[model samples]
Target: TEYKLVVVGADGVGKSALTIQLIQNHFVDEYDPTIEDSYRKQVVIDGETCLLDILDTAGQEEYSAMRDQYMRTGEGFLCVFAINNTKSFEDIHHYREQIKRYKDSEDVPMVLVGNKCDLPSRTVDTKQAQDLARSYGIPFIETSAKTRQGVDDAFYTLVREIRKHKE
Candidate 1:
């Protein structure tokens, strides 16, 4: 039951190359700039056999209110955006409205990753990140982590939406 997946965006927007290729599946063309925090290696999913601590933040816009209090101790959030960097997809609406005001619930299962996406000539055209994840109804994926592709189905589709919010 270990799952705290917070990997935000903005400065250089690869989020440590998609957290070192989803915790060391090994896909490095280049990476460096997580100078304040780190964690990795633990991705066993398939009926929720959990362990995905990949936190890697710190891009320093004065840490944006300390990244909203370190993303309110994240239960789940993978908003890393950078389909060839449009200001990291406009900083994903300030990391999705500051993570819905510190997880005060926009259902609390955010994922709109468009990281790298295997450089489709500098990406960001999957319907403009699916029209901004269908106009705020989150859960869109287009990862690369340097060609690991959708990067384990974007964290197994956010652990299947956190196991459907546990029924």
Candidate 2:
């Protein structure tokens, strides 16, 4: 069976960076404004093959409406926010609500990712993120696309959660 994993966040939050790191163990410096609307990768977790259909979206608030439409197709969503950027942190609630409303469920497996964990100096305190995740009753993880830290665990955790409910 295949699973659709959508990555949603504001621009510059390293959503693409996280996608690249997960699919390819490398860091990229350049950002392309125009790329495919969504990326597809076949990933094996445990003994099952799951297709990761990562939808890289525009950061504009206007574009969010379009992104909301795709939420119904996704089995899980990565609600990512950049630790270094406070605005990105604030948008998490909006992202969460959009998924809940459009996907027609609040119990969908979601990973609240605070990306760019490599830079400790520009951190958005973990307590803040955890509090939000707690209120939402979802797992929380800090990941760095540059260092590839916690990236695998973030996605793996979601897969594990889904597998748990399925079994």
Candidate 3:
């Protein structure tokens, strides 16, 4: 089966970096605003080979209109935020709520990810992030695109979550 995944977050929160690492297995050091770029890759989940159609969306508020369109096609979501940025972490609430609003379902498969785990200056701690995820009844993962930590697991978890909801 093929899954449509959406990556959304605030600007400079390493959303692109995480997506690049997952699709290319390499971390990008630059910040580039994405205007809806899709990447396809084959992944194995629970011994099943499936295609992942990942859409990376723009983080700027000016692209809010485009986000709704992206949300409609997403079967799963990887809501990313930088651990070092408090605003980015807080903004995740908006993305999560937006996903539910657009998908029009409270049971949408989603994962909350805290990126930049390698940074020592993290403003959002693991406990806080985990608590937030638990409040929403979703999984929370910490990752570092620079060190390639937990990047794959985040996507894989979301894929499994999406597959689980499949009837």
Candidate 4:
């Protein structure tokens, strides 16, 4: 089975870092502005080998016009935010609303990702993030890309959710 997943969030929210950690199992310390990048990986979820085509998207507002295009192509979405940044967390609704507009379905498969969970100081707590996801009717998870924590779980959760919805 194969799935196309798109990661979207505010700038500096660690979307790229999370993607790099999930695909390479390594942390990238530097932040480089991403235009658009795609990765392919073979992953085992629940003992099933599945191919994941992941689209790492740019978070800058300059690239906002291109987001609708990405949303249209993705089979599932991961709306990411940095736990230490309040603005990033608040901007999740923008991405989610856009996803619904582009996909034309409120039932779009998705997961809310709170990145940078390893940081000492956080502006958004797990409960806050979870509450937001629950309000939007989506799965929620916290991850630390630097420590490789919960990265795979975020991806797997979305993949499994997509599969379940499709079935």
Runs in model 2 with CA error above 4 Å? 34-36, 60-69, 165-167
lDDT of each: 0.75, 0.81, 0.87, 0.87
Q: Tens digits of per-residue lDDT for model 2 on 112-167?
A: 99999889666588999999899998899989999999998888887776665566
Which of the numbered candidates is closest to the native, going by highest lDDT?
A: 4
Give the per-residue lDDT digits (tens) of candidate 3, residues 29-136.
675675557789998877889999888877555646545666896899999999999999889989888899889899999999999999999899899999999999
Output the TM-score of candidate 2. Answer: 0.87
* Position 61, candidate 1: lDDT: 53
* TM, every model: 0.31, 0.87, 0.92, 0.93
Of the two candidates 2 and 3, the one with more favorable TM-score, higher being better, is 3
Instruction: Mark the regions of model 1 whose C-alpha exceeds 4 Å error after superposition.
Output: 1-80, 98-107, 120-142, 145-148, 164-167
Q: Candidate order by lDDT, highest to lowest?
A: 4, 3, 2, 1
Q: Where is model 4 more than 4 Å wrong at Cα?
A: 60-69
Q: What is the lDDT of residue 120 in candidate 4?
A: 84
Q: Which is the winner by TM-score between candidate 1 and candidate 3?
A: 3
Worst 10 residues of 3 by lDDT: 59-68
